[model samples]
Structure formats: structure tokens, C-alpha cells
Target: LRSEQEMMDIFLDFALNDERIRLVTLEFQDYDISYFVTDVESFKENDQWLEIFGKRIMMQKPEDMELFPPELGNWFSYIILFEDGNKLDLTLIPIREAEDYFANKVLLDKDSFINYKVNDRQYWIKRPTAREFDDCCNEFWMVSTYVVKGLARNEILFAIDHLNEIVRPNLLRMMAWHIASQKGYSFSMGKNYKFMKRYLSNKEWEELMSTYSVNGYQEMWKSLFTCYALFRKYSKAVSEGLAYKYPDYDEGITKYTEGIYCS
Candidate 1:
């Protein structure tokens, strides 16, 4: 209650004083509140900048003029450049589209409003459903076929494409979900698996990183198998943790992939 009061105090100051602020929503990630301001670029020059944790910050608002609801904006990690060479990220939203998102009392649901410290992070942080789990397992194994095809042809570009585009995303998602089962689902791994290593063993993190390569066929083969090993381990764990059936084709596909490589 006291904390919310404090946020409301700060928020109230901004709302009242800053005309550029059309609305402020109380969203959080990690521990930082995502202050969604309508016309946040006002602060780029205005005296409305703030200091937190002994660091002064100024908004470095994004360009390209794309705001809100995809095809451009995903709305997170607005960089605040501090004078002493420090950085902060706020999920700042600039309401450029008054006609579409906000014209007059244009509230959609609970997410569109502003208030206290909210559990709105739950929207991003949730356990994948059993079906979602099943589907990822299918995706990981199915994409493994492309990795196999690319590597046997000695096409480094093709193999790397499969590794990065087709295979790794599904691997990382399942790995993160398996992590959520151990840690709480409320926690996130951050963008591009930045914080995912916090829950992993040191060797596990290193092994995960080892799967990235553009060297040659030998390295790609090793990376592919390493990826397979990881995806297999996590997929089984997630399947069990979610009480979903582990797909049968994992081991079968592994053997097939290896047979193609040797032959």
C-alpha cells in the first residue's frame, strides 16, 4: 500500500504537471515499472527527466515513427541515457496515434489504464499450456530435419539458417519453460535469453552457447548434436513437468539424423 502510494505520488506529479503525458499505466518487468506515457518525446527536451539509484537519466526515444500495436512497436526497453555513462530501460509508450488508440476515453481493458504497482507482468509471464508444450516438441524435432538437410549438403548458410531460425527458438522456449517449472513462472528470462542462464548450471550455459557457430561442417555437426541433446533433455523435462506426453519421434529422429550424416 505504501509503495503504491509512492508510485501514485510520482505518477500524480507527472500526470498533473506534464501535459505531454496523456496517460500513465503501472506495468512492471523485473522490478522496474513500465511507465507508458502518451507523448514521451516531450521529456527529451523538457525538465521532466528524473534521477534514480544515484543515476540521472534522459530519454533517448526511438525513431522510425512507428508507435503501438506491432508492425513497428513492441513497446519495451526505451533507453535512458545517464550523464555518467549508465543506462536504464523503461517500457515507455508514446501515444502518437491519437485517432486509433486514444481519442476520447479510449480504454480497452485493464491493461489500457494507469495505476499502482500491477501484476500485469502475468500477461508475458505464464506457463505454456500442455498443447503448447506438445507443439514445441514437435517444432524442435521437425526443424531438426532442416539442420540435417543443410549440414549434409555442406551448405554453411543453410545449416546456420536452420540452427538460428528454425531450431534455436523452439529450443530456447522449451528450455525457458523447463526453467519456469523449477523457478516460478512469474519470472522471465529477459530478451533474447539474456537472463536465462541464471537458472542454468555453469556448464549448461556454456554448452548452450557452444551451439552457435559458422566455422565448418565438423563444428556445425557438433553444434547440431549438442543442440539435439539439449532440446531432448529440456523437452522431456517440460513434458513431465507439465504432465504432457513426450513425443516419440525425438530419439527416432536423432538416429535418422545421425545415419544420414554417416552415410
Candidate 2:
């Protein structure tokens, strides 16, 4: 409940008492209060050090997970949330990795980064191609059949997985292209299309949100159909803007989706 200046002052005092805290990097946009430590000993001592703040509501150490490897530049990444609403995302870099911690960041003039980076960092969005757009459309229509298959077999979880993982990503890619058609490709849609709601109209946004229904089989079917309509709407817009050929398989897929309806 403390003000921003109060928090800063408290943090400064906390840092002054500890020799391990080499630097305190402030990030306003992302709300990261990164405390760069001296070594692994400093990182390990964080358990006792963090008590100076309020109680931690959550904690996670990503380095422990073998499935998702930690970043090359970081020895270990630690994230913690205090009950006071302040969160700390700490990265522990060994002396070897710390030498070039802020290395290889290049910002191009053409880039329009909606969010700010900690240090001067590159704002990169892949250059879209007609071939890639075609591929995305092809994948969307193809995997949509998998969702229909799951629904036909009464496997709601399977259908939801395919819809979320495979089908929706392609729809999002098409939507990104649609946004680029008007807004230009210089800017990003942010992580997982977080910035997309700003561009879509209220009606369009509500329709898009309607596609996330997961109550039961009936809702799932309706959601799938909504996804189909949205994909068609955005894909066509993208194809026209980019002068790319729109695929004719949409009708076939629509029929296939309808063919599996339970009656």
C-alpha cells in the first residue's frame, strides 16, 4: 500500500545494508525491481534477505525445471511475489555470464515497440511472407479437423487442446496480419497477442471472446464454428491486403465441421 517513492526509499535502504546487491535496476513498464547480486552465495542468501519485505505470497525457481531450460545468460531465474503486491523477478548470472549481460541489443529505426525494454534492447518481429501466410491458413484449416474429430469422439479435453494449441495460434497469426494491413508491420501485437484488443472493434472483440466457451459439448461446437467464422474473416482481409491468394478449402472445412454435428 506504500507509494512508489516510499517503496524506492525502502528498497534503497535495503540495498545499502547488503553488500551482495551490486545494483538495483528499475523497470517501470514491466514493474521489475531487479537486484543484481554478486554471486551464487548472494542469490542463495535471498531467502533470508527477502524477509525485509512483506511476506512472499508466491515463489518459483525456473532453473529447477528440466523440461523448460533456463536462459543461457542466466545462472538461475527466481520470481517471487510479496503480499504487498510488489513482485521481484531476479536473474542470477555467474561472473562468466555477467561480463556480457547487456550485450547484443540493437534497436532498428523501423521498429515500433509498444512496450519498453529494461536496457536498450532489440524490438524484433519476424518479417511476414506470402508463403508463410499461406502455410498458416493451411495449418489452421487442417488442424481444425482434429478438433472436430475429438468432438465427434466426445473427447472434450482433446478438442480443447487442439483448438487452443494448434488452431487458435493460426487464427492469431492471421489476426496479426490483418492488424498489420492497417497498422503496418513495424509494431508488434505483444506477447500472446495481448495488444490485439486495442485494434479490434467492440463487436469484433466480443465475438472473438465468445470463441473461448468450454462449458460442454454444445458450447464447444459453437465455439469451433465461431473460430471458423473469425478465421475466415481475418484471413480474407489479410490475403486481400497482402495480394496473396485466398485458399478455396474454407468451404470444404466448413462442411466437414458441420457434417460431424450431433443430432
Off by over 4 Å in 2: 1-127
Worst 10 residues of 1 by lDDT: 105-114
Clashes in model 2: which pairs?
Answer: none
Give per-candidate clash totals.
1, 0
Candidate 2, residue 138: how far the Cα is off, in Å: 1.1
lDDT of 1 at 233: 85
Top lDDT prediction, candidate number: 2
lDDT of 2 by residue, 140-232 (tens): 999999999898998989999999887876776677567556645333343455545644668867877888985798898888888898999
Error of 1 at 132 (Å): 0.6
Predicted candidate 1 versus true structure: per-residue lDDT over 92-192, tens digit per residue: 56654433433341111112232222233322323678787777778888888888888887777887887887688677777767656764423333444
Q: Which parts of model 1 are misplaced by more than 4 Å?
A: 1-32, 35-81, 85-125, 187-191, 195-201
